[PDB]
Design a protein around this ligand. Sequence first.
Ligand SMILES: CC(C)(COP(=O)(O)OP(=O)(O)OC[C@H]1O[C@@H](n2cnc3c(N)ncnc32)[C@H](O)[C@@H]1OP(=O)(O)O)[C@@H](O)C(=O)NCCC(=O)NCCS
Ligand SMILES: CC(C)(COP(=O)(O)OP(=O)(O)OC[C@H]1O[C@@H](n2cnc3c(N)ncnc32)[C@H](O)[C@@H]1OP(=O)(O)O)[C@@H](O)C(=O)NCCC(=O)NCCS
Ligand SMILES: [Cl-]
Lengths: 488, 488, 487, 488
Amino acid sequence: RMAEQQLYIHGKFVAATSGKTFETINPATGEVLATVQAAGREDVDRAVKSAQQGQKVWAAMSAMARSRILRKAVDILRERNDELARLETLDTGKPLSETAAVDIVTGADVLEYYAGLIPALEGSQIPLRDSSFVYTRREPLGVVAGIGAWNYPIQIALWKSAPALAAGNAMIFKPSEVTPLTALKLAEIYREAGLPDGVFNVLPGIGAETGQYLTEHPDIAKISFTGGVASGKKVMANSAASSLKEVTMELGGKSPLIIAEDANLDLAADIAMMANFYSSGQVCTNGTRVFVPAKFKAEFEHKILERVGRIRAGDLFADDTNFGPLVSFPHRQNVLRYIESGKSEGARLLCGGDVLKGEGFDNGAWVAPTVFTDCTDDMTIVREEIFGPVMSILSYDDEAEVIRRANATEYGLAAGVVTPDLNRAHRIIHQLEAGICWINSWGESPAEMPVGGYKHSGIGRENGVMTLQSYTQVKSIQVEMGPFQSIF
Amino acid sequence: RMAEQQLYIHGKFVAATSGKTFETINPATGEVLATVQAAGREDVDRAVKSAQQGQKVWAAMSAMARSRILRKAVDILRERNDELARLETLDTGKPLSETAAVDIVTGADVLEYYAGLIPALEGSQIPLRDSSFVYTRREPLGVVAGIGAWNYPIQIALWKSAPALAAGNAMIFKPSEVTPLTALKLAEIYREAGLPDGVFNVLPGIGAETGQYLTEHPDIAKISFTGGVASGKKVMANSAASSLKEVTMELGGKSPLIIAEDANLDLAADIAMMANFYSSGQVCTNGTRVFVPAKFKAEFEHKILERVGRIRAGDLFADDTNFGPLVSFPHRQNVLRYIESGKSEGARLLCGGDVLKGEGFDNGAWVAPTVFTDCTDDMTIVREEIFGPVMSILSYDDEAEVIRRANATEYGLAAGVVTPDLNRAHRIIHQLEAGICWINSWGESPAEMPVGGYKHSGIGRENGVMTLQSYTQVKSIQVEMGPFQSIF
Amino acid sequence: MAEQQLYIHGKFVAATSGKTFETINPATGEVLATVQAAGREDVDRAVKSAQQGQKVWAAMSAMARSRILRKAVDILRERNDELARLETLDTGKPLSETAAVDIVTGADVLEYYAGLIPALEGSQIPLRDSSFVYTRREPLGVVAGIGAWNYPIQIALWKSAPALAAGNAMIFKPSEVTPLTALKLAEIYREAGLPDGVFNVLPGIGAETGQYLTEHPDIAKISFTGGVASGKKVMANSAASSLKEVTMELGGKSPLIIAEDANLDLAADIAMMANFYSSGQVCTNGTRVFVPAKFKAEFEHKILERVGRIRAGDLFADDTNFGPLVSFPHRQNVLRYIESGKSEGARLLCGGDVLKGEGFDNGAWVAPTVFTDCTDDMTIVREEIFGPVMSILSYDDEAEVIRRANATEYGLAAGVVTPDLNRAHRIIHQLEAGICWINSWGESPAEMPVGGYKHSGIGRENGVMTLQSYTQVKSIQVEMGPFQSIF
Amino acid sequence: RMAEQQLYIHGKFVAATSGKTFETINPATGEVLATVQAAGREDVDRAVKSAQQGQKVWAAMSAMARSRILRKAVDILRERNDELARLETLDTGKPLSETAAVDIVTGADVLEYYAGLIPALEGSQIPLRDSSFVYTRREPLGVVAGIGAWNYPIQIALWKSAPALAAGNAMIFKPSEVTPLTALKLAEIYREAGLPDGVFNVLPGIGAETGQYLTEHPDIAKISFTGGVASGKKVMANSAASSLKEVTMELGGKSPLIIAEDANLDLAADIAMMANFYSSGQVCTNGTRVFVPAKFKAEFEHKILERVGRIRAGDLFADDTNFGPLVSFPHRQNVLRYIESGKSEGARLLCGGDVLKGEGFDNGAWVAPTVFTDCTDDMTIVREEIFGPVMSILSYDDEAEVIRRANATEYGLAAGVVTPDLNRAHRIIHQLEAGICWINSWGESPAEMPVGGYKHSGIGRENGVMTLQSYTQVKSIQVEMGPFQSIF
Ligand SMILES: CC(C)(COP(=O)(O)OP(=O)(O)OC[C@H]1O[C@@H](n2cnc3c(N)ncnc32)[C@H](O)[C@@H]1OP(=O)(O)O)[C@@H](O)C(=O)NCCC(=O)NCCS
Ligand SMILES: CC(C)(COP(=O)(O)OP(=O)(O)OC[C@H]1O[C@@H](n2cnc3c(N)ncnc32)[C@H](O)[C@@H]1OP(=O)(O)O)[C@@H](O)C(=O)NCCC(=O)NCCS
Ligand SMILES: [Cl-]
């Protein structure tokens, strides 16, 4: 066990005044990775006053000065990629083959992107008449709060903190209690790059206490939350009741992958695998409802089974391992309950469905890669996000039907279609009710591409130019050079 | 009186199935203007199903076809300006001198503005590599809901419905129970202009029921609310708990008006008058904290007294009337309680402070134009929105001090400065924490200018190009033309 | 008809040149009208009129300008058929085209820009707490447009709409071949409430009236539509005189690529519309049709079947879809190109000569003409003909067709016909042209910027960007801090 | 002495095949700094084929890959700032107090700015109907040519190459024959940073041969030229006559500085000094027509003379030197002809008017700081750009008059106003016909700010986001998914 992990406030680690702690577990062994201090209500207020002071220094700097500091943070992240990836693997259970190639790399890509856009953040000017004009400023919100999830801890912290800092704000970040460690490292890296004290503070803790203290604080102007649909509704509600904060929410999904009647089934099966079993199924954007034409279903199932057999579970630091345990043991239990629900409702188990057993698996929160077929739109596993390695295969007959069924859900995060046909690809995608759409691929989320959910899957967007703007507030200023007329 | 007012669903007036009605009162005479049907839970569901069907027709039209229909609505509104203004006066008690020059004129201006921008609504295209690119669509939200306030009934209905419809949505509008009449007229006008049935439905009712049914409905994608700060928090919370709706909120303020030491005091007094006594003080953006340099306070007070003496209360249809009663007797009661708190807390009454009495006033909720001076930052009348004709005059000594005090509030809607000095005007305005800032003027809200609140005064914005975009949602589409690679 | 005058400051006025020219009806050979030609003094009058009007125009509110342009739109829709008939007499294009395309799409662009006027915005850039920058998009002032003869009224609208919408006054010179509809537009604009001087029309000869505009010191921009060679001279003269901003929409030799998986009925329909509309007198025409060798014979048969359905005749008849060429001198140039095709070894698939008989002997008719077995070195393949002459070329592989499609000084338009998702985007992204069509040809939405690569143009028309290109940026720095001198 | 300077083509120095050379002179001593090879027609053809090959490599990289390479060039330029400034001082005669603080600093600022914007370069997407949409690409022009001037050699090379390279083009740069040395250093710096071979080639030579050969070449897509008005017309003409190239031109001016009646005259005099005598008056944007109110003329003249007396000419590497010789002896002769016309036409000489003589000046191209007053709008020195240290003071009586006179010129590059009054500052500036306007300052040209001329002072702009886009060409693409209809 590491030394007791402290809070990060105003450029330094600092002891919590709450008197409370929590533990993070290595999901591959069950051992305690570390004891972590939990931020109390007084700790949150202290972090906010620190952030207010830092934000004023940060915002008073020039745009290019802020860009240079974020770019130095990028360089440090690239250099420390493997060290951070290893820590992320210990905390999350994700294979090093993933964490060393994706988590920090794509997190730093977004920070690098926004570092370069700071000088392009511009207001507007509007002429009204010769004697009057309007101009606008895109001003910082002030102090914002980001609340992270556990599947991509450092990536999420970068995707929230990068636009927030680039827009001139200070952010107080609360990582998930499951995976608090990499965010504390990120805080040191930012300071090492020259970020002014207070601009990025990290408050580990529990959602019911630390997260709620942030959502309630009167001087925080915005909350950005990544997490579950149910917890999101609570965060957004508490954020409104306290001080009417601006809100961004990235929640889960039940995204459909539509295989067209002209699709090559090797390509479709490869896309379905990457849409379901990367990060052991713990990805909000996963294509967990795979729609396949009835005439192809039997062949597609065989192609899925062959590729499931190639999945290589084992030591998370081994080069060939491409599948890990789930993030925690309680989470494994929920995934298993969904699997039992699939059996009890009559879905046909094609493969998996149980924990992994044997030396190297008995002490980890492993679930076998699991595929259900003969699925129907009313089944619990088809309707609800599992956030585990569980693919649901559904047969369909015609294009209009599959679009209706793909859209008949409260979720709206992602979608995809597999087809070589120009007209079919655009025609279908334009009709799907989702914010993130992939044609003949899955999963790639470039820094330039806004991503977020329709309907219950989210509020607002992340990434792209628009997210830099959404971390500012517009001030309109009218200059009246004419004589003002009063009717009184 | 008038005929019983029904609901407007799918291009026709229709009876409510709630079995409930309410009365709208003429605030100048006390007479029942009309009996109005109240939309029940089932009526809201009918309106949503109507809106869904109409929205599909609307969105499938070409952009210019939508533009032309809204422009026909503009032309009808210009032709009926005076008739609609007189109706607005009957329902609100605001003088015809105001309604015939502002309410419909500026409401129709915003509709004309967005009508012309529909064809300019564009997504983006982002090249990733030779073998892949991303493009974005700005898609309609679907069915959205507007909830109006009673001070500017038809203007609010136009400022919400114009961008929502121009963005390809259908809107269900709930007017305030105080002032439902003009919204029903607007619904007929839209139909007459060629708006497809269902695209604009109007559901009169009470906030506790009809408003709550809209915030709760699972198939409404966005709520846009104008009203008080307190009611706003309830709407925003209920929108999250039910279906995680996008939300826009335009709430009240306690906006500061800063008179600089080099200001001409006749101009300052004229601006203060217009910032406090228009629409009898029932304006969210009013400059109700008037900061005057200590050395000019006495002279400024004299100039206010002289201009207050010229305010002309009387017949609301006479050209020289420039002051009306408050919208209801309960609202006047609240304004009178604030005036009494001002007296009891030691503020000096400069003028007014009582109800108006005599023939032509006894049946209306009239309050005299009221000015308090010798005010301090801790007084109730200085800290809280009154929404009545009550100006608070505060003295200050230096620029840094006045900026602090101007910003030391939870409200953030508007602000202004009076100064002929180039540096002082821009320098002060840039430090003020408000979304709407006026230099040497007050009140003008051009269609091009985004307007909305900082902090507790609002979420999001109205008007400007950005509000058109905010009634769309982004879908990002990646076209991957290279061979997809699975790691499994 | 009545002797046609110049239009300056809201009225018809006699030219001071003492010179006139005649415009010929291309279907009968008869003189339609005698038109006065603007001299150097007339241009100076138009410019001073424009300077006075532009100030009135620019001082109005943005929405005031929008309403006036929208009222011109309403007048244009109501007089569509009348304007179309005049266009047919002057151009020779069938009424089936002029009543459905010329005024409709010209008015579409005017309607489009009318609505964007209030969205024209500058920027604001903070530098530090004590200094910021804001920009204005200011009118250029007086700008000049020089039209072509194939789409007289449409081109006048596509140039004047963004110019006026941006707050400028425009002096428009129509082609001497086709001056009549531009003068009608001038009246319509005035009837809509456009202030006097904001749109002046100066008919005349390119060698005189055009050159006087390109040389005038108080004109800030020249916008020219025409041939590549004429464009180079206009742009040079605009530079040598007063360093004007320039926009040029010139000709092309645009390629139409038929893919190996293309449906040949669709390909043939696209090739027909890309070659024989307006009798082949369209700058964006796909006059190089690349077809896979394995499909060439079938494609040739399908083209011939559709050429036989072409209906030449009375231009005011509903079923007529093919007209004479705009002038007899132009037909002479088109016939010389056809003879080179014959002499250089291209195989004549149909047409190749003038049309004869009652109703055709007195008009400047050329039959729909198709060459095949063409090679990249032939004159008919390398140079814009601007007549109804399709060249069919065979190809074997994708890389080859892209190299050959791009192997030209022209850069205006291009297209591909394919149902395959990857092939359509992949090929289009590599073609060196500004206007690219997938599984279609010819559509030019008001929202879509259009213009040429390489020798086919400078700048763009239509879309939001063209509104901005008719403004000039002024950057303004507000320095609220103390200024420090090193002296 | 330095080594014979060669051409830079495809990542290496290479001998010209023209057989021709020229010499660059140290303007402070008259000595030969270096012999420089002159590129002939064949060398130009080779550089274009090099550029075509390099441009393909550069454009096929990712946007962030291009961004990183330019950022490494920024880092090298910052580290080598003093060495580069010293070389520029030797080649131009500008004091090191200027070159080490401005030339490379602001040149590198612009490269840094555009490096970060590469990922934000985006096309558009326009929906037409359900069955068809349009998207646009911002494609590189290909090979572009920059032709520099001699007053700010390395800065001009950076301001032209930075947006051109950031947009994916290759640039062939021709420096002025007066000042070729720093451009060749920049080429090595770009290669050291990782710029692919051929993307930045430098061809020293004469305008009549090397300049003309580039403007004529069929495979160069755009010309960007900085220089005199007369040469500009010739460049723009040859660019059109050959292959109809896109053009950008930054030419000279006769920019007005308007001192208002309420201006502080010390501030006005400091601004006029910086607007006339920086770089010895060899700045295109200089405020050489100084309009002063008649009532303040005498006092303003006194304050100018006092500040002129502080000008410190001397050793160009000494810290306190703030005034240098002119760039060449032929240019001094032209400046002297203008000064003589000022005397002969009746303008009153307040100071200067002759060369500087004595030890340390006799071998340099020195002209004394010169001020004329009692100037009138018809004088040659008032109407024509001198590009030397010659200020013209003009008296005026009222605002309308000074605006007319300020605008009564074929030039349009810059302008400025000195006034503390809010209304006067914006009101006057909005009426001036110039692309670059300064209020209460002069000379600052932020990377974010587009700069360029009205009328004869230029075509197009430099700096700002718009200049990155102007180095691309728009391709519009319509996808028609519905059945195509032929009328034949
Ligand atoms: C561990 C597990 C229980 C999820 O944790 P949870 O307690 O349900 O919380 P959520 O993931 O919904 O919310 C994310 C974060 O919101 C915050 N949060 C929760 N309740 C909060 C509240 N009332 N106020 C403020 N913040 C709160 C916490 O920081 C939480 O981090 P956590 O994941 O460690 O709890 C897991 O078994 C699970 O259900 N995961 C499936 C998917 C999911 O619900 N969310 C993950 C991303 S979609
Ligand atoms: C520039 C030139 C080549 C144009 O060739 P062209 O297009 O065959 O010539 P045209 O006279 O038909 O010009 C076409 C259009 O440009 C117009 N035009 C010609 N000169 C113009 C000018 N200086 N300004 C404006 N418009 C001009 C013509 O009026 C005509 O308009 P319209 O036909 O639409 O009514 C020709 O005008 C010229 O100057 N010839 C001398 C050089 C030459 O022939 N080529 C040298 C080859 S090495
Ligand atoms: Cl050195």
